[PDB]
């Protein structure tokens, strides 16, 4: 199957060309909305933290995959292990608000406290890159914030960006995979 | 905002995606 390569028009041959028989697939697992729909730890440093998805680790499935797109939209779900009252505030709110309790404040019920929050930016969509503040989902504050996780719901992605693996030392990257106990 | 090792809120934040919190 010769093509004019310069064209940039997609080409996909099949085993049929030599006599094989292309089968079926179920790429459920490689579905955007689906893969990103899970929790990811985000490194919190203070007892108050602005919610931002770019803070997921760049090599973590979610963050790696989110960064594999340039523009994105989604709602949020959060799981915080905290102490005292947890207060959330919407994108663009004066930071001073975090102290006020009439804002969505959740009392303690350990271990974690789970919430569903609406996309709250003022743009039609947000970005992974940018060639020039508002790119957030609001902020959270609790007397103590031991741990923080976020989950992207309803995810939409636009324009793909690259996504690299590990550069192997030798011919392939060998390593220890889950195996049964030797006995 | 150019590339950059800085922080959003800092006088250099207008160059940070790098860390102007990526995106304004």
């Amino acid at each position: 199957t010769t093509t004019t390569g310069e064209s940039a028009d997609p080409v996909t041959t099949t085993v049929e060309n030599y006599g094989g028989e292309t089968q079926v697939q179920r790429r459920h697992h490689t579905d955007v909305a689906f893969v990103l729909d899970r929790f990811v730890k985000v490194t919190v440093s203070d007892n108050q933290h602005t919610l931002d998805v770019m803070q997921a680790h760049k090599d973590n499935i979610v963050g790696a995959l989110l960064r594999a797109a340039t523009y994105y939209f989604s709602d949020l779900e959060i799981a915080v292990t905290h102490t005292g009252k947890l207060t959330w505030v919407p994108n663009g709110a004066p930071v001073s608000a975090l102290n006020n309790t009439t804002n969505p404040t959740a009392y303690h019920k350990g271990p974690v406290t789970r919430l569903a929050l609406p996309y709250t930016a003022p743009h039609r969509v947000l970005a992974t890159a940018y060639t020039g503040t508002s790119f957030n989902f609001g902020a959270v504050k609790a007397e103590t914030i031991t741990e923080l996780l976020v989950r992207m719901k309803r995810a939409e992605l636009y324009c793909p960006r690259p996504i690299l693996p590990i550069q192997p030392t030798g011919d392939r990257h060998k390593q220890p995979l889950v195996a049964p106990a030797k006995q | 905002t150019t590339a950059y090792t800085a922080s959003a809120r800092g006088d250099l934040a207008h160059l940070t995606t790098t860390a102007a919190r990526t995106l304004p």
Partner: antibody
Framework: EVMLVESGGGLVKPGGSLKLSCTAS????????MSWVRQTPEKRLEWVAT????????YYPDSVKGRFTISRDNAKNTLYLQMSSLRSADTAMYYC?????????????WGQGTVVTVSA | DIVLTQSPASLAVSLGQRATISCRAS??????????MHWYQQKPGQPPKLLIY???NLESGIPDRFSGSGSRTDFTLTIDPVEADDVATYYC?????????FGAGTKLDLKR
């Protein structure tokens, strides 16, 4: 080589005005962010203002907002700090600092100074 | 405003000894994966001289007798060994967050 010589110091009465210049040499000025820091009599150092990258996004501490203006002239490589309503607290030795290079890395390369003496 | 508090404010130290200088910020000075803490040397009549610039890394070629460490709030200059070409007032300063605060200095002098 890199070179920041400031000019414009003086004795001024309260409420008065001066404009300093930081004349620059030995680097591409038009593509670097610039600062003024002062040093008070009792030898403590206050930042004064920062102008962005050969264009403008200007930044100030509270004591000086309203009274002091940082401006730059990329055409003839001179930074300015116009100062109105000189409060006697403003008697300091003023330095032109190159603020930015690849990153945020301190204030390396500091000018030499001009003193302002606000006194009646 | 973040406030920095240097300790001691003047120390006398014998030549070849070790002088350490702590600088506490009232609230974190790290942003991103960077402490934005800077250390300067002011000899009488000199402009300040940048010495250390993100808490640990030295500038240009100032002597390796000079080092810094510190994360968040607690930062230290270490001069080990002190030579007489070090008498001066030392300052730490932060660049994480406007208004770019500056510590009080510590005047190092020589125990003779």
């Amino acid at each position: 080589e890199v070179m920041l010589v400031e000019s414009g110091g003086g004795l001024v009465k309260p409420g008065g005005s001066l404009k300093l210049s930081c004349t620059a040499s030995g680097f591409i000025f038009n593509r670097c962010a610039m600062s003024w820091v002062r040093q008070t009599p009792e030898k403590r150092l206050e930042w004064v203002a920062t102008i962005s990258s050969g264009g403008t996004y200007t930044y100030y501490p509270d004591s000086v907002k309203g009274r002091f203006t940082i401006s730059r002239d990329n055409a003839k490589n001179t930074l300015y700090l116009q100062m109105s309503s000189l409060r006697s607290a403003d008697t300091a030795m003023y330095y032109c600092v190159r603020r930015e290079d690849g990153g945020d890395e301190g204030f390396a390369y500091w000018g030499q100074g001009t003193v302002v003496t606000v006194s009646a | 405003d973040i406030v920095l508090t240097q300790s001691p404010a003047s120390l006398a130290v014998s030549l070849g000894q070790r002088a350490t200088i702590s600088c506490r910020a009232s609230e974190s000075v790290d942003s991103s994966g960077h402490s934005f803490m800077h250390w300067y040397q002011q000899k009488p009549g000199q402009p300040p001289k940048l010495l250390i610039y993100r808490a640990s890394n030295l500038e240009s070629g100032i002597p390796d007798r000079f080092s810094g460490s510190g994360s968040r709030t607690d930062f230290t200059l270490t001069i080990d060994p002190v030579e007489a070409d070090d008498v001066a007032t030392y300052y730490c300063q932060q660049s994480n967050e406007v208004p770019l605060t500056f510590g009080a200095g510590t005047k190092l002098d020589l125990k003779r």
